[PDB]
Amino acid sequence: MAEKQYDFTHVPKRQGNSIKWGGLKEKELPMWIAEMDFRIAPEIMTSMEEKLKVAAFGYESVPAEYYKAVADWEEIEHRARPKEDWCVFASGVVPAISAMVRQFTSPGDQILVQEPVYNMFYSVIEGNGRRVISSDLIYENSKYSVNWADLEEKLATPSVRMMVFCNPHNPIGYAWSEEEVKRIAELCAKHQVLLISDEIHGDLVLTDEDITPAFTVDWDAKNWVVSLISPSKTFNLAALHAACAIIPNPDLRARAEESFFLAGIGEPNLLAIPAAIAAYEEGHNWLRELKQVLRDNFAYAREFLAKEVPEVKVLDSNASYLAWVDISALGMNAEDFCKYLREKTGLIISAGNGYRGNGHEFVRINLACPKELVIDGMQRLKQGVLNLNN
Amino acid sequence: QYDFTHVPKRQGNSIKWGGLKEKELPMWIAEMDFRIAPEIMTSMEEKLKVAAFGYESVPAEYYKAVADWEEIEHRARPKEDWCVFASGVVPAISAMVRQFTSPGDQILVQEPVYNMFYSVIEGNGRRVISSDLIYENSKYSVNWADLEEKLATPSVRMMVFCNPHNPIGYAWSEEEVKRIAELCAKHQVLLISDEIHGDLVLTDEDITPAFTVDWDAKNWVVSLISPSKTFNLAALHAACAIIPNPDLRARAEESFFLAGIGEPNLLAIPAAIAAYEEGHNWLRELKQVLRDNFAYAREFLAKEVPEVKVLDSNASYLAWVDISALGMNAEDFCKYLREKTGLIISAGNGYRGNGHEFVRINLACPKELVIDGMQRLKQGVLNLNN
Ligand SMILES: Cc1ncc(COP(=O)(O)O)c(C=O)c1O
Numbered sequence: 001m002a003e004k005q006y007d008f009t010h011v012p013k014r015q016g017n018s019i020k021w022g023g024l025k026e027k028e029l030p031m032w033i034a035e036m037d038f039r040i041a042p043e044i045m046t047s048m049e050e051k052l053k054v055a056a057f058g059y060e061s062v063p064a065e066y067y068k069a070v071a072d073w074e075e076i077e078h079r080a081r082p083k084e085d086w087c088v089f090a091s092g093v094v095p096a097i098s099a100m101v102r103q104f105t106s107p108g109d110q111i112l113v114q115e116p117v118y119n120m121f122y123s124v125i126e127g128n129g130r131r132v133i134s135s136d137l138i139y140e141n142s143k144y145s146v147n148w149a150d151l152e153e154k155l156a157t158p159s160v161r162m163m164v165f166c167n168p169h170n171p172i173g174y175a176w177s178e179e180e181v182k183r184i185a186e187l188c189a190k191h192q193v194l195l196i197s198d199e200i201h202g203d204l205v206l207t208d209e210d211i212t213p214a215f216t217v218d219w220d221a222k223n224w225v226v227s228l229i230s231p232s233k234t235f236n237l238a239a240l241h242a243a244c245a246i247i248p249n250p251d252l253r254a255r256a257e258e259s260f261f262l263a264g265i266g267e268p269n270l271l272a273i274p275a276a277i278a279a280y281e282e283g284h285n286w287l288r289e290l291k292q293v294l295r296d297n298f299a300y301a302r303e304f305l306a307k308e309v310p311e312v313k314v315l316d317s318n319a320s321y322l323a324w325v326d327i328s329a330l331g332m333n334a335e336d337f338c339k340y341l342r343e344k345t346g347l348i349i350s351a352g353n354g355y356r357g358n359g360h361e362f363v364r365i366n367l368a369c370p371k372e373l374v375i376d377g378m379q380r381l382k383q384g385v386l387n388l389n390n
Numbered sequence: 391q392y393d394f395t396h397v398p399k400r401q402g403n404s405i406k407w408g409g410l411k412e413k414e415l416p417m418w419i420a421e422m423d424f425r426i427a428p429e430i431m432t433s434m435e436e437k438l439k440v441a442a443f444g445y446e447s448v449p450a451e452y453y454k455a456v457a458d459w460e461e462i463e464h465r466a467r468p469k470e471d472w473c474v475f476a477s478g479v480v481p482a483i484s485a486m487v488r489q490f491t492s493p494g495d496q497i498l499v500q501e502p503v504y505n506m507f508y509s510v511i512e513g514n515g516r517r518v519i520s521s522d523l524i525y526e527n528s529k530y531s532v533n534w535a536d537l538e539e540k541l542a543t544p545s546v547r548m549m550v551f552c553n554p555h556n557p558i559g560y561a562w563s564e565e566e567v568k569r570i571a572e573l574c575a576k577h578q579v580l581l582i583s584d585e586i587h588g589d590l591v592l593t594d595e596d597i598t599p600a601f602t603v604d605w606d607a608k609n610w611v612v613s614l615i616s617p618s619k620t621f622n623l624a625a626l627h628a629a630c631a632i633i634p635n636p637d638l639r640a641r642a643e644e645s646f647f648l649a650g651i652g653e654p655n656l657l658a659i660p661a662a663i664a665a666y667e668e669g670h671n672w673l674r675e676l677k678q679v680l681r682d683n684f685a686y687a688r689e690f691l692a693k694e695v696p697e698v699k700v701l702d703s704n705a706s707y708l709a710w711v712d713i714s715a716l717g718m719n720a721e722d723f724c725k726y727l728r729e730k731t732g733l734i735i736s737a738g739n740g741y742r743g744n745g746h747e748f749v750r751i752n753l754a755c756p757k758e759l760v761i762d763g764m765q766r767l768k769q770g771v772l773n774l775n776n
């Protein structure tokens with residue numbers, strides 16, 4: 001090849017309290033939870049080791065440099081520069097959603113999602129005492145589509161007060177077109193519904209199709225949107241706890257910031273600021289190479305399952321390092337299949353059940369690991385399927 | 391064995407030191423101007439070498455380190471099962487305010503007390519009620535009749551207890567903590583005992599954690615701890631709730647997850663474990679520097695600014711200074727001090743109670759900074775008399 005500047009071959013050796021790699025049995029292969037088995041960009045590491053040299057970790061403000069980095073990143077990577085004053089630090093995307101659920105809806109209000117969607121959406125809606133309402137994505141011809149009439153009918157319902165929009169959508173791995181994003185933002189604005197656009201997979205569109213950040217919608221609807229971003233999925237920094245809400249409406253923004261502070265997610269920890277700035281200032285080259293690795297892993301995985309496991313169907317996706325795999329032909333509830341698969345092969349993938357929708361027919365597989373592990377997992381999956389047919 | 395002489399060089403986004411004018415001396419916000427313990431630094435450096443920061447569990451090595459630390463430092467040992475990770479003490483209070491009380495309910499504090507108690511009570515739409523600490527003869531005391539009368543009020547549903555008490559720097563006696571816990575249990579009031587200053591008792595005394603009170607009251611208590619104040623790790627975001635009642639504990643744990651404060655960041659677990667397993671020697675050295683600084687502060691002011699009084703305190707690195715004899719509202723005295731001398735201390739007003747007669751001074755800094763701050767304090771008063 002042309003030499004890659006960075007290391008996508010060696011799996012980082014985690015400490016014992018890793019969710020992905022802790023308490024596994026011998027030879028078990030975790031490909032479920034969405035973190036990478038790649039080392040992070042050395043540019044980010046350098047900024048973290050630099051910060052540690054302070055050797056005292058008192059209270060931190062959010063510097064202008066943080067929002068500048070966020071804005072520069074969105075401009076360069078997605079050709080949509082937010083205003084830096086739109087940006088508000090939050091310690092995490094899901095905690096920010098949870099705080100905005102409490103701040104911008106009332107107990108008993110309904111909050112719209114499009115099932116199947118990220119399981120943590122349900123937890124922060126239901127656990128906060130709001131009610132999930134879904135305009136289900138319709139599954140036909142191996143693709144999901146939106147029932148736009150049903151979506152609007154639910155948005156227009158008085159008790160439906162917020163839409164948590166997954167953009168790109170996890171677990172189906174779909175980066176919405178500009179038209180779809182602006183249509184949903186316009187729908188929300190029309191019906192006075194707050195659009196929370198979870199854009200945490202936005203840097204991981206594995207094609208050149210870009211995302212459309214919600215904050216780029218025109219100024220009728222722009223006052224009704226919040227874009228949520230983080231370096232965590234892009235750069236393998238789940239535990240960094242750095243995120244950013246982009247809220248063009250200044251009063252909404254100040255209220256969300258107040259809700260972040262009140263909840264305890266408004267203040268950066270000791271690494272969040274320098275590590276996120278380094279990621280958004282200097283992570284471009286590493287991300288470029290990562291997407292080349294991911295496209296290689298996906299090309300292999302999709303080709304393998306096409307030729308070798310016709311019992312399953314990998315859905316066409318263009319975003320995320322996660323594959324959404326239809327296992328319906330196995331006649332087995334995804335939760336039962338994933339248990340069986342783990343017991344027989346050691347491969348641990350995500351049952352689709354927790355994403356609701358039709359997720360009980362699907363598994364989600366994380367391909368953000370060295371190709372050796374992709375090959376291992378794909379072969380284990382075939383071994384699991386073959387063991388059923390016998 | 392450790393460096394308590396040289397102030398760490400912060401990056402620019404520091405709350406205590408960022409954006410100061412030339413030669414300004416901040417002694418207000420409670421973070422130290424000391425290097426952290428090298429044993430903690432070692433664990434952070436090695437964790438960064440993982441070079442990938444995915445999701446982390448709370449290992450029960452964390453709970454074991456917490457239990458061991460409480461036993462060594464306070465002679466009190468919680469059951470590991472009682473322990474729930476939280477990223478911060480104040481956010482845990484805020485979550486428990488939302489989980490365990492209703493909007494409009496009253497939540498009892500003992501003024502003057504930590505300003506952030508008011509922020510999380512009132513910010514969540516609960517109402518602060520205070521049984522004010524009685525201030526007589528330079529000492530604060532509890533009006534036990536008043537306290538119980540308010541705790542017995544039906545709409546008073548929670549007590550946020552500062553143990554040791556910031557800003558006065560008082561580690562309650564065993565009898566005091568038990569009596570408060572008994573009163574809370576008697577009136578079905580949840581006792582949230584903020585013990586974040588619990589490792590900073592400077593006398594030969596020990597705090598009494600709320601979780602040590604006996605089972606006729608232990609079901610009504612929550613102890614909150616963190617290495618933050620002890621080890622100068624405000625930005626680590628590691629803390630722990632100790633909740634003996636398992637029903638409360640399950641509900642508190644869920645409220646932390648929903649708030650976004652239930653999950654450790656990439657350094658919280660190894661750094662806190664290192665602090666609790668290996669920080670005893672550094673803390674022992676810290677306390678002697680703190681006692682030396684308090685002694686200097688008390689002696690200097692007794693000789694030089696006799697119209698002010700450093701309260702006898704047994705806990706924390708925060709001096710609570712009665713300035714009432716200056717005849718000046720504390721907030722105006724602090725603004726005047728900053729403008730005239732560059733010394734930035736904490737006005738007492740924000741702690742409510744009788745806080746307008748007090749300032750709070752952070753002595754967790756090298757002796758040379760204390761000497762400077764005291765000198766500026768005297769100079770400000772001298773200039774007022776001129
Ligand atoms: C759609 C979506 N939102 C949010 C998150 C995580 O957000 P955070 O950990 O910053 O709260 C993930 C995880 O990768 C995700 O897939």
Ligand SMILES: Cc1ncc(COP(=O)(O)O)c(C=O)c1O
Binds near residue numbers: 420481482556
């Ligand atoms: C009484 C008290 N509680 C809590 C805190 C800080 O809590 P948190 O861990 O939320 O920053 C402080 C600050 O040092 C404090 O003095």
Ligand SMILES: C=CC[S@@](=O)C[C@H](N)C(=O)O
Binds near residue numbers: 418419421736
């Ligand atoms: C004005 C001072 C802000 S502050 O120090 C809150 C603090 N951490 C404490 O211990 O009270």
